[PDB]
Design a protein around this ligand. Sequence first.
Ligand code: SF4
Ligand code: SF4
Ligand code: SF4
Ligand code: SF4
Ligand code: FES
Ligand code: K
Ligand code: ZN
Lengths: 263, 208, 176, 126, 96, 360, 48, 95, 113, 114
Amino acid sequence: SNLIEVFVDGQSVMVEPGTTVLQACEKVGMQIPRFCYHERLSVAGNCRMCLVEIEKAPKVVAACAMPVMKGWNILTNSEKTKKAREGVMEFLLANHPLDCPICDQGGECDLQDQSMMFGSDRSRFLEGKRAVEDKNIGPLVKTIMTRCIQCTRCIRFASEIAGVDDLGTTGRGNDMQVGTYIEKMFMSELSGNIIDICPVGALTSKPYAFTARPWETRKTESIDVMDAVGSNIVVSTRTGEVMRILPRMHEDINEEWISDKTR
Amino acid sequence: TRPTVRPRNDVAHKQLSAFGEYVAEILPKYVQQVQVSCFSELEICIHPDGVIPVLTFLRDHSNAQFKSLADLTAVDIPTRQNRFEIVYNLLSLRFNSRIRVKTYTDELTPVESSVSVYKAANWYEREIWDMFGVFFANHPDLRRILTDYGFEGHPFRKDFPLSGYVELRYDDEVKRVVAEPVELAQEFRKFDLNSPWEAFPAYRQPPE
Amino acid sequence: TYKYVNLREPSMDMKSVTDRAAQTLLWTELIRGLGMTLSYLFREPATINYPFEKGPLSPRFRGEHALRRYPSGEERCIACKLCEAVCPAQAITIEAEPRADGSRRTTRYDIDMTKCIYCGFCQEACPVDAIVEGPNFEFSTETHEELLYNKEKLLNNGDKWEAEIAANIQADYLYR
Amino acid sequence: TQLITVDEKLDITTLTGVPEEHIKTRKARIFVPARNNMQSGVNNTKKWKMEFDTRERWENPLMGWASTADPLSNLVLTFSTKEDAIAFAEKNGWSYDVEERKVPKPKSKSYGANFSWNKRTRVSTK
Amino acid sequence: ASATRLIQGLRNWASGRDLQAKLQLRYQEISKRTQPPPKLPVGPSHRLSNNYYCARDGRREAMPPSIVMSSQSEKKAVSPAPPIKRWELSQDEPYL
Amino acid sequence: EMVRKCDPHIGLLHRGTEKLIEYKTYLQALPYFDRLDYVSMMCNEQAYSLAVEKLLNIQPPPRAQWIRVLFGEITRLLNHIMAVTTHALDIGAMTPFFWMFEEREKMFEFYERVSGARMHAAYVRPGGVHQDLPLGLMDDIYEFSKNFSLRIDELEEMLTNNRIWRNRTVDIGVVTAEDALNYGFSGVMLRGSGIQWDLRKTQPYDVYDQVEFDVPIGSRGDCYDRYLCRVEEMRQSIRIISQCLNKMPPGEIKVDDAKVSPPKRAEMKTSMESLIHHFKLYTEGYQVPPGATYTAIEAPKGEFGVYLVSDGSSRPYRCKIKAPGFAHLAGLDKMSKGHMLADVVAIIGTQDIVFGEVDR
Amino acid sequence: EDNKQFFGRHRWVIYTTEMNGKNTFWDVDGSMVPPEWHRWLHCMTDDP
Amino acid sequence: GVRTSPTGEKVTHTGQVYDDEDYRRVRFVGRQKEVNENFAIDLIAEQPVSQVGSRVISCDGGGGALGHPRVYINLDKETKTGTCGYCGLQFRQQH
Amino acid sequence: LLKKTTGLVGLAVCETPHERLKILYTKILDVLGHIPKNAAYRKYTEQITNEKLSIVKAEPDVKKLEEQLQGGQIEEVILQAENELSLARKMIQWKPWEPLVEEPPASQWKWPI
Amino acid sequence: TSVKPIFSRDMNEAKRRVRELYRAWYREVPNTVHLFQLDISVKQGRDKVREMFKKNAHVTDPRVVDLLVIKGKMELEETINVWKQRTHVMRFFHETEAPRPKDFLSKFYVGHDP
Ligand code: SF4
Ligand code: SF4
Ligand code: SF4
Ligand code: SF4
Ligand code: FES
Ligand SMILES: [K+]
Ligand SMILES: [Zn+2]
């Protein structure tokens, strides 16, 4: 075997050549924080949350995109790795709106969770925030684009998995707006999985909008019957009433997606 | 790390590591692990056959003199094949120190009663019998202490539900408080509160 | 750093022995106790005239619950369910949906006041000052289900006690 | 000798005080819980679980609350391995099914594949 | 406070103490029920620089318990700590 | 007349507190501790707070620690008033009960001014206290403590030199020192028998090494010396309250780790990190690192210990509550032998037994 | 008001004989105080 | 803005009213159904639309710390006003 | 000087503390001589017992003996000598210098699970 | 497979203890009907004791039946002493509970429980 030897916090691990730093850390049971990375999309490399330290190297590397080299010690819990995470979380929460109570992603938000786990605990931002114009891309996906962190999981999903090529970023700089640029209605058969792979509340389920909250739901693991694919789903119930339907990750059927009828 | 972080007590940590080596080499027949936590609390992990020798040693040795039983506790951990974790919290008034003696049993192996060492345990391990089902052999008066008199099942076991299996109401037919199966007017809402992101890297368990 | 309570040796001269025997035969400490009880007989009692006089309370006081509103008539609760997530009694039951103008508002906001432990975690977890635990404590009922408040009872408590709850929050919010 | 040889099956169901209705008619489910696809974290998918079949939840006539008659409805047990959960289910007379751990297969990620020369994996945007 | 001097004198005599100096009924010497608004100070972490959370992360410095001995000379017999210093009798009021 | 065997049947107020703690977070399980020893509320709050702050590897600010010691000694005054006055009311002296519950009413007004509830404050929290002192409170604490010595003086006038009180207490309930250690006694049950041990001196917590007080040591182990120990502990608690009012520092009242203690509502409504941290602390709560601890404080009844176990999550895996009244009521069987049925109620009075902490 | 009384007696209310229709000549009630006077009477403020 | 069903029962602001064939109207027999007659959905439609001269306006519900968390509202749509997600006050750019 | 009381209830004043401590320390050494020499309990207990017996023989005073034995009153030093004697008699019967009776299960003391 | 016994080395000593516990309950039931002044007969109480002993008649583990004998002796000491009230004795007789549906068809009629 052509496995090369890399080190994750001093611990040796044998990886295939071409393996990213994030997967080399995943093999030892360590999950690097990420926002744009998603293992079924392509690698964007732009949320800059996976900035990990390789020792004897005076620059942090993007772990979702950087391939490993033989002999690297990937310092996942080092000081400048943690400073990189706190700084990038600070810039992510600079213009992010104070919507956590009125947001359907609260309690199931990656931005909240790894701001608690990897970010700082207070704000140095003493300025005005941006307010991004909302869009209408269908009766299924509620669009609140002030909450967007421009991670382009939308665009990679609609480009690669749904195969639509109609979502995209318009603008340049802090005025860059993910959308369709026109009053276009993103109706695929897979148009609801962008609610799954939005890490923030910028794309939320419009039938599930405002109705429940993820800590009080009971996750029941069931099967789809809308089609003969047999999509593994989660039925989440609150007080004996069906609240939504989430996918289950099953590699051999529906990798982590479901259709809009199922959802 | 000055104002908002707890100050670390390295002196008591080194003293308890030395005394843990002391206990581990005086009594190697029973001591399995010795560990000192980062907030400097010594733990002696023993075999369940060494309840009386370890506690008598700590009560009577001149370098221990743990004359006071503070607390005695079981902990149900169902993923272990010896699911109960009987925990002895001792107090030395001479050396101004505390030690934690920990052992184990399952549902069917009895722990030897420590009332011949500490008479404080006469209600504590009685409570452990009442709450967990751990039988204590050679106990003076072992019976229930907290539950209702006809109460079946051991409540602090983790396979026991929060509300029980029966509830009480007064029944005017039989003119008597009766026991009928529990039916809540509002079910206890279970909250899945655990974050999916890892909180502490120092406690990361190695994968398979 | 310690003191000995009750470690006095009594004197055995005839003066102190006769003092103790006069205390024994003439009941001197019993007359001292009668004198102290007689001294409280001639004091003004601490008794307030309830219901016409009331016990002194602070603006932090935690009594009857109330759902509040903004200064526009719009109710403050935006259905975020922090108060039933933090409620240590699970007294609060919340259901929600978008109403006719699409706003995130509750349809159910119940509080079982017979579960409630009156600890005020809901008013301190509420990000919009919607649920408050107001100053009313004289709300004793004659039926058990009268203490099972729905959203309408709590909105009427808010509309009833807003003129007092607003001033208590005005007096207290700089400590929060 | 002070040790005895017992070759029988470990069964403590006469000692747990659970009634027969909640022993022989309940179905335990031994499973690693699926990842919340709302999130990317995998810390909740580490340990095995044991929950039971969901029995009836009905409406309270007074308040509309979720009434139940099921004591095991909120009971979720956390196990380190699959076999510990199977041993705990067999010890307590609970009928069980086992869903295996569904680990995601390793992906061949290439950032340079997004800008290929002749392959269909070119991104049209970034 | 409203008591006449005869009742006040009888009361002080019967208790053996002066009771108007220490009244258990409160009067206008207590604080005002309406108070000026506070300006509460902030903590030490309210800083705009040299305030990285990783250098003051309290929860993340707790390590697992250091295993002293496990089953996987003429060295000194030790105690868990130095023996306790004997308490000194109070110089304030020992009742001695 | 004599008592041969005394069998206290308990569990009549068993609520299953420390199983309900397992299904609630640390902030939600804090108000369970107000109701264990329900005359020593903020002391049990302080013990659970110190357990969670030991596991979280954080510390309260100085002003929060001084407020904790101030209200802990107010709490000690409350509990010893309850102890002495009901121990006198059960024997028959009903009058100093009414005399001291007005002072106790004023201290419940202190609790209501600082927290909003008169008894169960949920105020002393992991990280510090919930909220700062309102303006004008310490002046009223001064005006209380300046007069409370005369109240202890007239209580001690009614009971201490009284021959009927000494007949019901002097030859009653005598415990040797080795039996008090062996029965796991704590606090006044140790110190009446002469054992020089007090957890505020030997193993001190928040700022008790910076306050100066004396520890009343009994001589005969009987009911009467433990009565005098509680009276002198009220004297010394007035002493500590004077030192705490004089040495109060300024500053914050929570830990400024906003991942543990929640941010202020002024900055919760302005900042983004502060809103995320408010949200996640009041729904999920803070995570505690894995570990078991035994934190024990000097409760006004004795040693109130908590064996708290964390699995790494935001809820306690196991939380054992060691209470003094459990071991004291276990020792009732030896203390009542050789005495009469009238002496048993005196022994249950001098063992300050609240059955909420006995039964949990 | 009577600020020479001790703290607890110094403020009181003489209830009306008719509130919301009910004869309250003998049936006085603690919850007859409106919320604007309930701060003053319960000493939550010094200002009526 | 409370209406009334044909059964004589007042309809809440949610829309809840018991049916005619529903036995649960017996709990109001001899007693009253306590509803709040100040519907917030009517009382926010009575508010005037704030004509601000900015492209992005902030709202905290008034009072500062006594309101809700401060949000920033975009006003680039001329078809629609900009409604605050918490307090429901709606804004319009005055050009 | 004949100390009037110890202060501890039930712990009576010993009239001859030095001779009593000599008897108890030599009786601890006599009992402890039956334990094998490779046991750490015997080495450590002979060490602390020889130190205590040397301090007792090297001090005619009672107060100074209390301040340098560093175990409180002299009567509870006597009581701890009695406890050590009874303990050593029990350690002969238990024989805990032997190896471990049973290894724990493989994930027994693993926390968290 | 080598475990520590509780009281019984094998099943025969365990059956001896089960038999003596049954003897003690059979002797105790008339006094229980008398001093609790239960409204049932002595034959009904003894048949309930027989029902409770035959509820556990399927156990072949000596430690489990040792703990069953220990718990039965505890209930017997709570009954000999007047520690139970009439309610704790009559909880063995589920009188106020309606009879549960036994067959498939009536359980199908009344609910969802198998
Ligand atoms: S997306 Fe996340 S961080 Fe943003 S408002 Fe919603 S819950 Fe808060
Ligand atoms: S809307 Fe969501 S998924 Fe799409 S780019 Fe923005 S943050 Fe990413
Ligand atoms: S005061 Fe406490 S118990 Fe009551 S509703 Fe609020 S959070 Fe729940
Ligand atoms: S915390 Fe406040 S806004 Fe949120 S659901 Fe409760 S009352 Fe409503
Ligand atoms: S995860 Fe690598 S940069 Fe977004
Ligand atoms: K989303
Ligand atoms: Zn607003």
